[model samples]
Target: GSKTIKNTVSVNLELTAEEWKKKYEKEKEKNKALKSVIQHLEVELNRWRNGEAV
Candidate 1:
Protein backbone atom coordinates (compact mmCIF):
# COMPACT_ATOMS: atom_id res chain seq x y z
CA GLY A 1 0.00 0.00 0.00
CA SER A 2 1.24 3.52 -0.74
CA LYS A 3 0.47 5.21 2.54
CA THR A 4 1.92 8.46 3.77
CA ILE A 5 4.74 8.46 6.27
CA LYS A 6 6.09 11.26 8.42
CA ASN A 7 9.47 12.02 9.95
CA THR A 8 10.51 14.36 12.74
CA VAL A 9 13.72 15.63 14.30
CA SER A 10 14.44 17.01 17.75
CA VAL A 11 16.98 19.54 18.92
CA ASN A 12 18.64 20.15 22.28
CA LEU A 13 21.00 22.87 23.40
CA GLU A 14 22.96 23.92 26.47
CA LEU A 15 22.16 27.03 28.44
CA THR A 16 25.66 27.55 29.76
CA ALA A 17 28.23 29.52 27.75
CA GLU A 18 30.96 26.89 28.20
CA GLU A 19 28.65 24.08 27.24
CA TRP A 20 27.48 25.96 24.15
CA LYS A 21 31.04 26.77 23.08
CA LYS A 22 32.08 23.13 23.45
CA LYS A 23 29.00 21.90 21.65
CA TYR A 24 29.52 24.32 18.77
CA GLU A 25 33.19 23.36 18.52
CA LYS A 26 32.26 19.70 18.25
CA GLU A 27 29.59 20.50 15.69
CA LYS A 28 32.04 22.53 13.61
CA GLU A 29 34.62 19.73 13.63
CA LYS A 30 32.19 17.29 12.04
CA ASN A 31 30.87 19.95 9.65
CA LYS A 32 33.99 19.88 7.44
CA ALA A 33 32.25 18.02 4.61
CA LEU A 34 29.40 20.51 4.56
CA LYS A 35 31.76 23.44 4.03
CA SER A 36 32.84 22.30 0.59
CA VAL A 37 29.24 21.85 -0.56
CA ILE A 38 28.35 25.23 0.86
CA GLN A 39 31.36 26.93 -0.71
CA HIS A 40 30.55 25.45 -4.11
CA LEU A 41 26.97 26.69 -3.92
CA GLU A 42 27.55 30.08 -2.32
CA VAL A 43 27.80 31.91 -5.61
CA GLU A 44 24.53 30.55 -6.94
CA LEU A 45 22.92 30.44 -3.55
CA ASN A 46 23.88 33.94 -2.56
CA ARG A 47 22.97 35.25 -5.97
CA TRP A 48 19.51 33.68 -5.86
CA ARG A 49 19.15 34.73 -2.25
CA ASN A 50 19.82 38.24 -3.45
CA GLY A 51 17.20 37.67 -6.16
CA GLU A 52 19.61 38.25 -9.08
CA ALA A 53 20.56 34.66 -9.94
CA VAL A 54 19.85 33.17 -13.34
Candidate 2:
Protein backbone atom coordinates (compact mmCIF):
# COMPACT_ATOMS: atom_id res chain seq x y z
CA GLY A 1 0.00 0.00 0.00
CA SER A 2 1.16 3.54 -0.78
CA LYS A 3 0.48 6.57 1.36
CA THR A 4 -0.25 10.04 0.15
CA ILE A 5 -0.08 13.25 2.17
CA LYS A 6 -1.54 16.73 1.67
CA ASN A 7 -1.24 19.86 3.74
CA THR A 8 -2.88 23.29 3.66
CA VAL A 9 -0.61 26.30 3.64
CA SER A 10 -0.65 30.04 3.17
CA VAL A 11 2.72 31.79 2.83
CA ASN A 12 1.38 35.21 3.76
CA LEU A 13 -1.76 37.32 4.05
CA GLU A 14 -0.96 39.14 0.81
CA LEU A 15 -1.31 35.99 -1.24
CA THR A 16 -4.78 35.75 -2.69
CA ALA A 17 -6.60 36.02 -5.98
CA GLU A 18 -8.66 38.98 -4.75
CA GLU A 19 -5.63 40.81 -3.35
CA TRP A 20 -3.63 40.23 -6.53
CA LYS A 21 -6.54 41.49 -8.60
CA LYS A 22 -6.81 44.70 -6.62
CA LYS A 23 -3.03 45.17 -6.85
CA TYR A 24 -3.17 44.67 -10.61
CA GLU A 25 -5.60 47.55 -10.91
CA LYS A 26 -2.93 49.95 -9.66
CA GLU A 27 -0.43 48.58 -12.12
CA LYS A 28 -2.91 49.03 -14.92
CA GLU A 29 -3.45 52.63 -13.95
CA LYS A 30 0.30 53.25 -13.78
CA ASN A 31 0.94 51.66 -17.15
CA LYS A 32 -1.89 53.65 -18.69
CA ALA A 33 -0.21 56.86 -17.54
CA LEU A 34 3.16 55.72 -18.83
CA LYS A 35 1.73 54.97 -22.28
CA SER A 36 0.21 58.43 -22.49
CA VAL A 37 3.59 59.95 -21.65
CA ILE A 38 5.30 57.82 -24.28
CA GLN A 39 2.76 58.81 -26.90
CA HIS A 40 3.24 62.50 -26.15
CA LEU A 41 7.04 62.11 -26.21
CA GLU A 42 6.97 60.26 -29.53
CA VAL A 43 4.87 63.00 -31.10
CA GLU A 44 7.22 65.63 -29.77
CA LEU A 45 10.20 63.70 -31.11
CA ASN A 46 8.63 63.52 -34.56
CA ARG A 47 7.79 67.21 -34.50
CA TRP A 48 11.38 68.08 -33.63
CA ARG A 49 12.71 65.62 -36.19
CA ASN A 50 10.89 67.52 -38.91
CA GLY A 51 12.30 70.80 -37.58
CA GLU A 52 8.82 72.20 -36.88
CA ALA A 53 7.59 74.52 -34.10
CA VAL A 54 11.13 75.46 -33.10
Candidate 3:
Protein backbone atom coordinates (compact mmCIF):
# COMPACT_ATOMS: atom_id res chain seq x y z
CA GLY A 1 0.00 0.00 0.00
CA SER A 2 2.75 2.44 0.93
CA LYS A 3 4.71 1.46 -2.17
CA THR A 4 1.70 2.16 -4.38
CA ILE A 5 1.23 5.57 -2.81
CA LYS A 6 4.90 6.41 -3.21
CA ASN A 7 4.85 5.38 -6.86
CA THR A 8 1.78 7.48 -7.48
CA VAL A 9 3.54 10.52 -6.05
CA SER A 10 6.73 10.05 -8.01
CA VAL A 11 7.45 12.66 -10.67
CA ASN A 12 8.93 12.20 -14.13
CA LEU A 13 10.49 15.40 -15.31
CA GLU A 14 11.24 15.64 -19.03
CA LEU A 15 14.16 18.00 -19.28
CA THR A 16 15.83 19.27 -22.40
CA ALA A 17 19.49 18.63 -23.00
CA GLU A 18 20.34 22.22 -22.13
CA GLU A 19 18.50 22.03 -18.83
CA TRP A 20 20.12 18.75 -17.83
CA LYS A 21 23.52 19.98 -18.92
CA LYS A 22 23.11 23.08 -16.76
CA LYS A 23 22.15 20.94 -13.79
CA TYR A 24 25.20 18.75 -14.38
CA GLU A 25 27.41 21.84 -14.42
CA LYS A 26 26.09 23.07 -11.08
CA GLU A 27 27.52 20.09 -9.27
CA LYS A 28 30.95 20.67 -7.76
CA GLU A 29 34.12 18.99 -9.07
CA LYS A 30 33.95 16.14 -6.57
CA ASN A 31 30.39 15.37 -7.60
CA LYS A 32 31.37 15.67 -11.26
CA ALA A 33 32.96 12.26 -11.03
CA LEU A 34 29.55 10.68 -10.76
CA LYS A 35 28.00 12.63 -13.66
CA SER A 36 28.30 9.85 -16.21
CA VAL A 37 26.90 7.29 -13.80
CA ILE A 38 24.01 9.53 -12.92
CA GLN A 39 23.22 10.25 -16.56
CA HIS A 40 23.37 6.55 -17.44
CA LEU A 41 21.00 5.66 -14.61
CA GLU A 42 18.62 8.46 -15.56
CA VAL A 43 18.52 7.28 -19.18
CA GLU A 44 17.87 3.70 -18.14
CA LEU A 45 15.12 4.74 -15.76
CA ASN A 46 13.50 6.95 -18.38
CA ARG A 47 13.64 4.15 -20.94
CA TRP A 48 11.92 1.83 -18.47
CA ARG A 49 9.23 4.42 -17.93
CA ASN A 50 8.66 4.43 -21.69
CA GLY A 51 8.12 0.62 -21.57
CA GLU A 52 11.60 -0.39 -22.67
CA ALA A 53 13.67 -3.04 -20.89
CA VAL A 54 16.73 -1.89 -19.03
Best by lDDT: 2
lDDT of each: 0.78, 0.86, 0.74
Candidate 3 lDDT at 44 equals 81
Worst 10 residues of 2 by lDDT: 1-10
lDDT score of residue 52 within candidate 2 = 89
lDDT of 3 by residue, 1-54 (tens): 554543445577786889877776775654876787799899887998888864
RMSD (CA, Å), each prediction: 17.9, 6.3, 21.7
**Which residue runs does candidate 1 get wrong by more than 4 Å?**
1-14, 36-54
* TM-score of decoy 3: 0.32
Candidate 1 or 3, higher TM-score? Answer: 1
The residue-level lDDT of candidate 2 at 43 comes to: 86
Q: Compared with the true structure, what per-residue lDDT tens digits does model 1 show for residues 1-54?
A: 377578566787657888889998988977876887788698677777879846
RMSD of 2: 6.3
What TM-scores do the predictions have? 0.33, 0.56, 0.32
The sequence of per-residue lDDT tens digits that candidate 2 reaches over residues 1-54 is 357577678666556778788989998999999999999899898998887875
